[PDB]
Amino acid sequence: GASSSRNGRDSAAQRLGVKRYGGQVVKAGEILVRQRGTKFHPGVNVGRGGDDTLFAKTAGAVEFGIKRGRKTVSIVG
């Protein structure tokens, strides 16, 4: 038969996506949304990360918002 296994490979699922949702209390350094590119943008008190990870600079509550079209994640202390 035809050896049509020309496409049978894939990479590992990288477990992307939002890790801490709105109104959820987090500590500083705790990653909020791990993603490719800037699907979400760092808001107030949120750092970006070398691989666009959007961590918390400070403890407090996660909140999502819009900043001139760009959708952003911030922490309110």
Partner 1 sequence: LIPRKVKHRKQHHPRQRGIASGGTTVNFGDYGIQALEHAYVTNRQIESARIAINRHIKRGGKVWINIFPDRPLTKKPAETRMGSGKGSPEWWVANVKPGRVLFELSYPNEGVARAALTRAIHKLPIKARIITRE
Closest separation between CB of residue 34 and partner 1, Å? 30
Piece in contact with partner 1 (CB under 8 A), picked from 2-10, 17-25, 29-37, 65-73: 2-10
Among the listed residues 1, 17, 37, 69, the single contact to partner 1 using CB under 8 A: 1
Token pair belonging to 17:
């996506």
Q: How many helices (H) and strands (E) does the chain have?
A: 0, 8
Beta bridge partners of residue 42, listed in sequence order = 73
Question: Strand pairing of 60-67 and 55-56?
Answer: unpaired
Site for RNA contains 54 (CB under 7 A): no
Binding site for partner 1 (CB under 8 A): 1-6
